[PDB]
Amino acid sequence: GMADEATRRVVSEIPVLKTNAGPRDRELWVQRLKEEYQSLIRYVENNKNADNDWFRLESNKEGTRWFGKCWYIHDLLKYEFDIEFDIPITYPTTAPEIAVPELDGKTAKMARGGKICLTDHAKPLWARNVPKFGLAHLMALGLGPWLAVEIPDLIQKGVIQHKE
Protein backbone atom coordinates (compact mmCIF):
# COMPACT_ATOMS: atom_id res chain seq x y z
CA GLY A 1 0.00 0.00 0.00
CA MET A 2 2.55 2.58 1.28
CA ALA A 3 5.40 0.40 -0.17
CA ASP A 4 3.83 0.43 -3.72
CA GLU A 5 3.28 4.26 -3.53
CA ALA A 6 6.94 4.70 -2.34
CA THR A 7 8.26 2.62 -5.33
CA ARG A 8 5.91 4.29 -7.90
CA ARG A 9 6.94 7.82 -6.60
CA VAL A 10 10.68 7.02 -7.03
CA VAL A 11 10.53 5.18 -10.49
CA SER A 12 7.21 6.48 -12.10
CA GLU A 13 9.01 8.50 -14.86
CA ILE A 14 11.83 5.94 -15.60
CA PRO A 15 10.96 4.02 -18.82
CA VAL A 16 10.05 0.40 -17.91
CA LEU A 17 12.21 -2.30 -19.65
CA LYS A 18 10.72 -5.26 -21.59
CA THR A 19 13.29 -7.81 -22.84
CA ASN A 20 14.24 -10.80 -20.64
CA ALA A 21 17.86 -11.17 -21.93
CA GLY A 22 21.37 -11.39 -20.39
CA PRO A 23 24.87 -10.83 -21.83
CA ARG A 24 24.98 -14.05 -23.96
CA ASP A 25 21.51 -13.63 -25.62
CA ARG A 26 22.83 -12.14 -28.92
CA GLU A 27 20.15 -9.94 -30.70
CA LEU A 28 17.84 -10.03 -27.60
CA TRP A 29 20.76 -8.66 -25.47
CA VAL A 30 21.36 -5.86 -28.10
CA GLN A 31 17.63 -5.03 -27.71
CA ARG A 32 17.89 -5.19 -23.85
CA LEU A 33 20.85 -2.70 -24.02
CA LYS A 34 18.72 -0.26 -26.14
CA GLU A 35 16.07 -0.43 -23.37
CA GLU A 36 18.78 -0.02 -20.64
CA TYR A 37 20.26 3.12 -22.37
CA GLN A 38 16.72 4.48 -23.13
CA SER A 39 15.86 4.12 -19.35
CA LEU A 40 19.25 5.46 -18.05
CA ILE A 41 19.23 8.57 -20.32
CA ARG A 42 15.59 9.50 -19.55
CA TYR A 43 16.48 9.11 -15.82
CA VAL A 44 19.52 11.50 -16.19
CA GLU A 45 17.43 14.04 -18.21
CA ASN A 46 14.76 13.89 -15.41
CA ASN A 47 17.61 14.22 -12.81
CA LYS A 48 18.93 17.39 -14.62
CA ASN A 49 15.44 19.09 -14.60
CA ALA A 50 15.16 18.33 -10.83
CA ASP A 51 18.72 19.71 -10.16
CA ASN A 52 19.72 16.14 -9.07
CA ASP A 53 22.13 15.05 -11.87
CA TRP A 54 24.01 12.58 -9.61
CA PHE A 55 25.68 9.99 -11.92
CA ARG A 56 27.19 9.15 -15.35
CA LEU A 57 27.29 5.50 -16.53
CA GLU A 58 28.75 3.89 -19.71
CA SER A 59 29.21 0.22 -20.80
CA ASN A 60 31.90 -1.55 -22.87
CA LYS A 61 31.03 -2.58 -26.50
CA GLU A 62 29.29 -5.84 -25.33
CA GLY A 63 27.51 -4.12 -22.35
CA THR A 64 28.97 -6.71 -19.87
CA ARG A 65 30.87 -4.06 -17.85
CA TRP A 66 29.48 -0.70 -16.68
CA PHE A 67 31.48 2.18 -15.14
CA GLY A 68 31.10 5.88 -14.42
CA LYS A 69 30.80 8.25 -11.46
CA CYS A 70 28.20 9.27 -8.90
CA TRP A 71 28.15 12.67 -7.05
CA TYR A 72 26.70 13.30 -3.56
CA ILE A 73 26.22 16.89 -2.21
CA HIS A 74 26.48 17.28 1.62
CA ASP A 75 26.37 20.78 3.22
CA LEU A 76 27.04 22.20 -0.30
CA LEU A 77 30.24 20.06 -0.75
CA LYS A 78 30.16 17.64 -3.77
CA TYR A 79 31.70 14.12 -3.25
CA GLU A 80 32.54 12.15 -6.47
CA PHE A 81 33.04 8.34 -6.40
CA ASP A 82 34.00 6.06 -9.32
CA ILE A 83 31.47 3.17 -9.72
CA GLU A 84 31.63 -0.06 -11.79
CA PHE A 85 29.75 -3.40 -12.01
CA ASP A 86 29.59 -6.60 -14.15
CA ILE A 87 26.25 -7.76 -15.62
CA PRO A 88 25.50 -11.24 -14.18
CA ILE A 89 24.83 -13.99 -16.81
CA THR A 90 21.31 -14.50 -15.27
CA TYR A 91 20.46 -10.74 -15.58
CA PRO A 92 17.91 -9.24 -15.40
CA THR A 93 16.41 -11.79 -12.93
CA THR A 94 19.63 -11.30 -10.89
CA ALA A 95 20.44 -7.70 -9.82
CA PRO A 96 24.02 -6.52 -10.48
CA GLU A 97 26.20 -5.61 -7.45
CA ILE A 98 27.24 -1.91 -7.79
CA ALA A 99 30.87 -1.54 -6.58
CA VAL A 100 32.22 1.81 -5.23
CA PRO A 101 35.78 0.49 -4.90
CA GLU A 102 37.17 3.68 -3.24
CA LEU A 103 34.77 3.10 -0.23
CA ASP A 104 35.77 -0.60 0.19
CA GLY A 105 35.89 -1.60 3.91
CA LYS A 106 34.90 1.94 5.12
CA THR A 107 31.28 0.92 6.00
CA ALA A 108 29.62 -2.32 7.24
CA LYS A 109 26.77 -1.93 4.63
CA MET A 110 29.15 -3.22 1.92
CA ALA A 111 30.75 -6.54 0.79
CA ARG A 112 34.42 -7.11 -0.25
CA GLY A 113 35.32 -5.06 -3.37
CA GLY A 114 33.03 -2.15 -2.34
CA LYS A 115 29.94 -4.07 -3.62
CA ILE A 116 27.06 -2.16 -1.90
CA CYS A 117 24.79 -4.23 0.48
CA LEU A 118 21.33 -3.98 -1.22
CA THR A 119 18.47 -4.12 1.40
CA ASP A 120 16.32 -7.23 2.14
CA HIS A 121 13.30 -5.15 0.93
CA ALA A 122 14.89 -3.96 -2.38
CA LYS A 123 15.91 -7.48 -3.68
CA PRO A 124 12.36 -9.01 -3.63
CA LEU A 125 10.96 -5.72 -5.04
CA TRP A 126 13.40 -6.22 -7.98
CA ALA A 127 12.45 -9.97 -8.07
CA ARG A 128 8.68 -9.20 -8.31
CA ASN A 129 9.21 -6.66 -11.16
CA VAL A 130 11.53 -8.77 -13.43
CA PRO A 131 12.23 -7.93 -16.27
CA LYS A 132 10.67 -4.45 -15.97
CA PHE A 133 13.51 -2.89 -13.84
CA GLY A 134 16.94 -2.14 -15.34
CA LEU A 135 20.12 -0.29 -14.32
CA ALA A 136 18.24 3.08 -14.08
CA HIS A 137 16.01 1.40 -11.41
CA LEU A 138 19.07 -0.15 -9.66
CA MET A 139 20.61 3.39 -9.41
CA ALA A 140 17.29 5.03 -8.25
CA LEU A 141 16.31 2.23 -5.76
CA GLY A 142 19.80 0.85 -4.90
CA LEU A 143 22.78 3.26 -4.96
CA GLY A 144 20.68 6.49 -4.62
CA PRO A 145 19.31 5.67 -1.14
CA TRP A 146 22.58 3.96 -0.06
CA LEU A 147 24.56 7.21 -0.77
CA ALA A 148 21.92 9.27 1.19
CA VAL A 149 22.61 7.02 4.29
CA GLU A 150 26.37 6.18 4.02
CA ILE A 151 27.93 9.41 2.55
CA PRO A 152 26.62 11.59 5.47
CA ASP A 153 27.63 8.92 8.06
CA LEU A 154 31.18 8.64 6.54
CA ILE A 155 31.71 12.45 6.39
CA GLN A 156 30.61 12.71 10.07
CA LYS A 157 32.95 9.81 11.17
CA GLY A 158 35.69 11.78 9.32
CA VAL A 159 36.67 8.72 7.18
CA ILE A 160 35.76 10.40 3.81
CA GLN A 161 37.10 13.83 2.78
CA HIS A 162 36.28 16.61 0.31
CA LYS A 163 38.38 17.29 -2.87
CA GLU A 164 38.22 20.75 -4.72
PDB file of C-alpha atoms in Angstrom:
ATOM      1  CA  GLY A   1       0.000   0.000   0.000  1.00  0.00           C
ATOM      2  CA  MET A   2       2.547   2.583   1.281  1.00  0.00           C
ATOM      3  CA  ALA A   3       5.403   0.404  -0.171  1.00  0.00           C
ATOM      4  CA  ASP A   4       3.832   0.431  -3.720  1.00  0.00           C
ATOM      5  CA  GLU A   5       3.278   4.259  -3.532  1.00  0.00           C
ATOM      6  CA  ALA A   6       6.938   4.698  -2.338  1.00  0.00           C
ATOM      7  CA  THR A   7       8.255   2.622  -5.332  1.00  0.00           C
ATOM      8  CA  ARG A   8       5.908   4.290  -7.904  1.00  0.00           C
ATOM      9  CA  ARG A   9       6.940   7.818  -6.605  1.00  0.00           C
ATOM     10  CA  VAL A  10      10.683   7.020  -7.034  1.00  0.00           C
ATOM     11  CA  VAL A  11      10.535   5.181 -10.486  1.00  0.00           C
ATOM     12  CA  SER A  12       7.209   6.478 -12.100  1.00  0.00           C
ATOM     13  CA  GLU A  13       9.012   8.497 -14.862  1.00  0.00           C
ATOM     14  CA  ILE A  14      11.829   5.935 -15.602  1.00  0.00           C
ATOM     15  CA  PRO A  15      10.964   4.023 -18.822  1.00  0.00           C
ATOM     16  CA  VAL A  16      10.053   0.401 -17.915  1.00  0.00           C
ATOM     17  CA  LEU A  17      12.210  -2.298 -19.652  1.00  0.00           C
ATOM     18  CA  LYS A  18      10.723  -5.257 -21.589  1.00  0.00           C
ATOM     19  CA  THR A  19      13.291  -7.806 -22.838  1.00  0.00           C
ATOM     20  CA  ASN A  20      14.244 -10.800 -20.641  1.00  0.00           C
ATOM     21  CA  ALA A  21      17.862 -11.171 -21.933  1.00  0.00           C
ATOM     22  CA  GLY A  22      21.366 -11.389 -20.394  1.00  0.00           C
ATOM     23  CA  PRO A  23      24.871 -10.825 -21.834  1.00  0.00           C
ATOM     24  CA  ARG A  24      24.984 -14.046 -23.964  1.00  0.00           C
ATOM     25  CA  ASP A  25      21.509 -13.633 -25.616  1.00  0.00           C
ATOM     26  CA  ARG A  26      22.826 -12.143 -28.915  1.00  0.00           C
ATOM     27  CA  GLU A  27      20.154  -9.941 -30.700  1.00  0.00           C
ATOM     28  CA  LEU A  28      17.836 -10.032 -27.599  1.00  0.00           C
ATOM     29  CA  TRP A  29      20.759  -8.665 -25.473  1.00  0.00           C
ATOM     30  CA  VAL A  30      21.355  -5.863 -28.101  1.00  0.00           C
ATOM     31  CA  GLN A  31      17.630  -5.028 -27.706  1.00  0.00           C
ATOM     32  CA  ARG A  32      17.886  -5.186 -23.854  1.00  0.00           C
ATOM     33  CA  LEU A  33      20.852  -2.696 -24.024  1.00  0.00           C
ATOM     34  CA  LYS A  34      18.718  -0.261 -26.145  1.00  0.00           C
ATOM     35  CA  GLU A  35      16.070  -0.432 -23.373  1.00  0.00           C
ATOM     36  CA  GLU A  36      18.783  -0.018 -20.639  1.00  0.00           C
ATOM     37  CA  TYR A  37      20.264   3.122 -22.371  1.00  0.00           C
ATOM     38  CA  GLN A  38      16.719   4.482 -23.126  1.00  0.00           C
ATOM     39  CA  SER A  39      15.862   4.124 -19.347  1.00  0.00           C
ATOM     40  CA  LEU A  40      19.254   5.464 -18.054  1.00  0.00           C
ATOM     41  CA  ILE A  41      19.227   8.575 -20.319  1.00  0.00           C
ATOM     42  CA  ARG A  42      15.591   9.504 -19.548  1.00  0.00           C
ATOM     43  CA  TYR A  43      16.483   9.107 -15.823  1.00  0.00           C
ATOM     44  CA  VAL A  44      19.519  11.499 -16.194  1.00  0.00           C
ATOM     45  CA  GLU A  45      17.427  14.042 -18.213  1.00  0.00           C
ATOM     46  CA  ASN A  46      14.762  13.892 -15.411  1.00  0.00           C
ATOM     47  CA  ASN A  47      17.613  14.215 -12.812  1.00  0.00           C
ATOM     48  CA  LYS A  48      18.934  17.393 -14.623  1.00  0.00           C
ATOM     49  CA  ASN A  49      15.440  19.086 -14.604  1.00  0.00           C
ATOM     50  CA  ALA A  50      15.162  18.332 -10.833  1.00  0.00           C
ATOM     51  CA  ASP A  51      18.720  19.707 -10.160  1.00  0.00           C
ATOM     52  CA  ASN A  52      19.724  16.136  -9.069  1.00  0.00           C
ATOM     53  CA  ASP A  53      22.128  15.055 -11.873  1.00  0.00           C
ATOM     54  CA  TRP A  54      24.011  12.582  -9.606  1.00  0.00           C
ATOM     55  CA  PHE A  55      25.682   9.991 -11.922  1.00  0.00           C
ATOM     56  CA  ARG A  56      27.194   9.152 -15.348  1.00  0.00           C
ATOM     57  CA  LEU A  57      27.293   5.500 -16.531  1.00  0.00           C
ATOM     58  CA  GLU A  58      28.745   3.890 -19.713  1.00  0.00           C
ATOM     59  CA  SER A  59      29.206   0.221 -20.804  1.00  0.00           C
ATOM     60  CA  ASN A  60      31.901  -1.546 -22.872  1.00  0.00           C
ATOM     61  CA  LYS A  61      31.031  -2.579 -26.496  1.00  0.00           C
ATOM     62  CA  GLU A  62      29.289  -5.836 -25.330  1.00  0.00           C
ATOM     63  CA  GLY A  63      27.508  -4.124 -22.348  1.00  0.00           C
ATOM     64  CA  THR A  64      28.967  -6.714 -19.873  1.00  0.00           C
ATOM     65  CA  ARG A  65      30.867  -4.064 -17.847  1.00  0.00           C
ATOM     66  CA  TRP A  66      29.480  -0.701 -16.682  1.00  0.00           C
ATOM     67  CA  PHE A  67      31.477   2.179 -15.142  1.00  0.00           C
ATOM     68  CA  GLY A  68      31.102   5.877 -14.418  1.00  0.00           C
ATOM     69  CA  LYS A  69      30.796   8.251 -11.460  1.00  0.00           C
ATOM     70  CA  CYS A  70      28.203   9.272  -8.901  1.00  0.00           C
ATOM     71  CA  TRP A  71      28.145  12.666  -7.049  1.00  0.00           C
ATOM     72  CA  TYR A  72      26.697  13.300  -3.561  1.00  0.00           C
ATOM     73  CA  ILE A  73      26.224  16.895  -2.210  1.00  0.00           C
ATOM     74  CA  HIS A  74      26.477  17.281   1.621  1.00  0.00           C
ATOM     75  CA  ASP A  75      26.366  20.775   3.220  1.00  0.00           C
ATOM     76  CA  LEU A  76      27.038  22.198  -0.297  1.00  0.00           C
ATOM     77  CA  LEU A  77      30.243  20.059  -0.754  1.00  0.00           C
ATOM     78  CA  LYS A  78      30.164  17.639  -3.774  1.00  0.00           C
ATOM     79  CA  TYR A  79      31.697  14.120  -3.249  1.00  0.00           C
ATOM     80  CA  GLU A  80      32.542  12.150  -6.466  1.00  0.00           C
ATOM     81  CA  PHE A  81      33.044   8.336  -6.395  1.00  0.00           C
ATOM     82  CA  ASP A  82      33.998   6.064  -9.323  1.00  0.00           C
ATOM     83  CA  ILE A  83      31.472   3.170  -9.723  1.00  0.00           C
ATOM     84  CA  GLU A  84      31.630  -0.063 -11.785  1.00  0.00           C
ATOM     85  CA  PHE A  85      29.752  -3.398 -12.006  1.00  0.00           C
ATOM     86  CA  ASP A  86      29.588  -6.595 -14.150  1.00  0.00           C
ATOM     87  CA  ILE A  87      26.248  -7.755 -15.620  1.00  0.00           C
ATOM     88  CA  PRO A  88      25.503 -11.245 -14.181  1.00  0.00           C
ATOM     89  CA  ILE A  89      24.830 -13.993 -16.815  1.00  0.00           C
ATOM     90  CA  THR A  90      21.313 -14.502 -15.265  1.00  0.00           C
ATOM     91  CA  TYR A  91      20.464 -10.736 -15.581  1.00  0.00           C
ATOM     92  CA  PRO A  92      17.914  -9.237 -15.404  1.00  0.00           C
ATOM     93  CA  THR A  93      16.407 -11.792 -12.930  1.00  0.00           C
ATOM     94  CA  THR A  94      19.631 -11.300 -10.890  1.00  0.00           C
ATOM     95  CA  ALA A  95      20.440  -7.705  -9.821  1.00  0.00           C
ATOM     96  CA  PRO A  96      24.022  -6.516 -10.485  1.00  0.00           C
ATOM     97  CA  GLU A  97      26.197  -5.607  -7.455  1.00  0.00           C
ATOM     98  CA  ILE A  98      27.239  -1.907  -7.791  1.00  0.00           C
ATOM     99  CA  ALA A  99      30.873  -1.543  -6.582  1.00  0.00           C
ATOM    100  CA  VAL A 100      32.222   1.813  -5.227  1.00  0.00           C
ATOM    101  CA  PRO A 101      35.785   0.488  -4.899  1.00  0.00           C
ATOM    102  CA  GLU A 102      37.170   3.678  -3.240  1.00  0.00           C
ATOM    103  CA  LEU A 103      34.769   3.104  -0.228  1.00  0.00           C
ATOM    104  CA  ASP A 104      35.767  -0.598   0.193  1.00  0.00           C
ATOM    105  CA  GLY A 105      35.891  -1.597   3.914  1.00  0.00           C
ATOM    106  CA  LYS A 106      34.905   1.942   5.117  1.00  0.00           C
ATOM    107  CA  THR A 107      31.278   0.924   5.999  1.00  0.00           C
ATOM    108  CA  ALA A 108      29.617  -2.325   7.243  1.00  0.00           C
ATOM    109  CA  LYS A 109      26.769  -1.931   4.634  1.00  0.00           C
ATOM    110  CA  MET A 110      29.150  -3.216   1.920  1.00  0.00           C
ATOM    111  CA  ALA A 111      30.745  -6.541   0.793  1.00  0.00           C
ATOM    112  CA  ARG A 112      34.423  -7.108  -0.248  1.00  0.00           C
ATOM    113  CA  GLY A 113      35.318  -5.056  -3.366  1.00  0.00           C
ATOM    114  CA  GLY A 114      33.029  -2.146  -2.335  1.00  0.00           C
ATOM    115  CA  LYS A 115      29.938  -4.066  -3.621  1.00  0.00           C
ATOM    116  CA  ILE A 116      27.057  -2.164  -1.896  1.00  0.00           C
ATOM    117  CA  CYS A 117      24.795  -4.230   0.478  1.00  0.00           C
ATOM    118  CA  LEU A 118      21.328  -3.979  -1.221  1.00  0.00           C
ATOM    119  CA  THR A 119      18.473  -4.122   1.401  1.00  0.00           C
ATOM    120  CA  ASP A 120      16.317  -7.232   2.136  1.00  0.00           C
ATOM    121  CA  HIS A 121      13.296  -5.153   0.929  1.00  0.00           C
ATOM    122  CA  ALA A 122      14.891  -3.962  -2.376  1.00  0.00           C
ATOM    123  CA  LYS A 123      15.914  -7.479  -3.684  1.00  0.00           C
ATOM    124  CA  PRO A 124      12.360  -9.006  -3.629  1.00  0.00           C
ATOM    125  CA  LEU A 125      10.961  -5.721  -5.040  1.00  0.00           C
ATOM    126  CA  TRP A 126      13.396  -6.221  -7.984  1.00  0.00           C
ATOM    127  CA  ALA A 127      12.452  -9.969  -8.072  1.00  0.00           C
ATOM    128  CA  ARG A 128       8.677  -9.195  -8.308  1.00  0.00           C
ATOM    129  CA  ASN A 129       9.206  -6.655 -11.158  1.00  0.00           C
ATOM    130  CA  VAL A 130      11.534  -8.771 -13.430  1.00  0.00           C
ATOM    131  CA  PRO A 131      12.226  -7.934 -16.268  1.00  0.00           C
ATOM    132  CA  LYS A 132      10.669  -4.447 -15.973  1.00  0.00           C
ATOM    133  CA  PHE A 133      13.513  -2.887 -13.837  1.00  0.00           C
ATOM    134  CA  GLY A 134      16.945  -2.141 -15.342  1.00  0.00           C
ATOM    135  CA  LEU A 135      20.125  -0.291 -14.324  1.00  0.00           C
ATOM    136  CA  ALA A 136      18.240   3.080 -14.085  1.00  0.00           C
ATOM    137  CA  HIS A 137      16.008   1.396 -11.410  1.00  0.00           C
ATOM    138  CA  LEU A 138      19.071  -0.149  -9.664  1.00  0.00           C
ATOM    139  CA  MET A 139      20.606   3.390  -9.411  1.00  0.00           C
ATOM    140  CA  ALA A 140      17.291   5.027  -8.251  1.00  0.00           C
ATOM    141  CA  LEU A 141      16.311   2.227  -5.764  1.00  0.00           C
ATOM    142  CA  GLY A 142      19.796   0.848  -4.905  1.00  0.00           C
ATOM    143  CA  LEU A 143      22.775   3.255  -4.963  1.00  0.00           C
ATOM    144  CA  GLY A 144      20.680   6.492  -4.621  1.00  0.00           C
ATOM    145  CA  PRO A 145      19.311   5.666  -1.142  1.00  0.00           C
ATOM    146  CA  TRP A 146      22.576   3.962  -0.061  1.00  0.00           C
ATOM    147  CA  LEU A 147      24.562   7.213  -0.771  1.00  0.00           C
ATOM    148  CA  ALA A 148      21.919   9.270   1.185  1.00  0.00           C
ATOM    149  CA  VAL A 149      22.608   7.023   4.295  1.00  0.00           C
ATOM    150  CA  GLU A 150      26.373   6.184   4.021  1.00  0.00           C
ATOM    151  CA  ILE A 151      27.935   9.408   2.550  1.00  0.00           C
ATOM    152  CA  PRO A 152      26.620  11.590   5.472  1.00  0.00           C
ATOM    153  CA  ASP A 153      27.631   8.915   8.063  1.00  0.00           C
ATOM    154  CA  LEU A 154      31.179   8.640   6.536  1.00  0.00           C
ATOM    155  CA  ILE A 155      31.714  12.449   6.385  1.00  0.00           C
ATOM    156  CA  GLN A 156      30.607  12.710  10.069  1.00  0.00           C
ATOM    157  CA  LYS A 157      32.949   9.810  11.173  1.00  0.00           C
ATOM    158  CA  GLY A 158      35.688  11.779   9.317  1.00  0.00           C
ATOM    159  CA  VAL A 159      36.673   8.720   7.179  1.00  0.00           C
ATOM    160  CA  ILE A 160      35.759  10.404   3.806  1.00  0.00           C
ATOM    161  CA  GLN A 161      37.099  13.828   2.781  1.00  0.00           C
ATOM    162  CA  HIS A 162      36.279  16.606   0.313  1.00  0.00           C
ATOM    163  CA  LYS A 163      38.379  17.292  -2.873  1.00  0.00           C
ATOM    164  CA  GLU A 164      38.220  20.748  -4.720  1.00  0.00           C
TER     165      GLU A 164
END
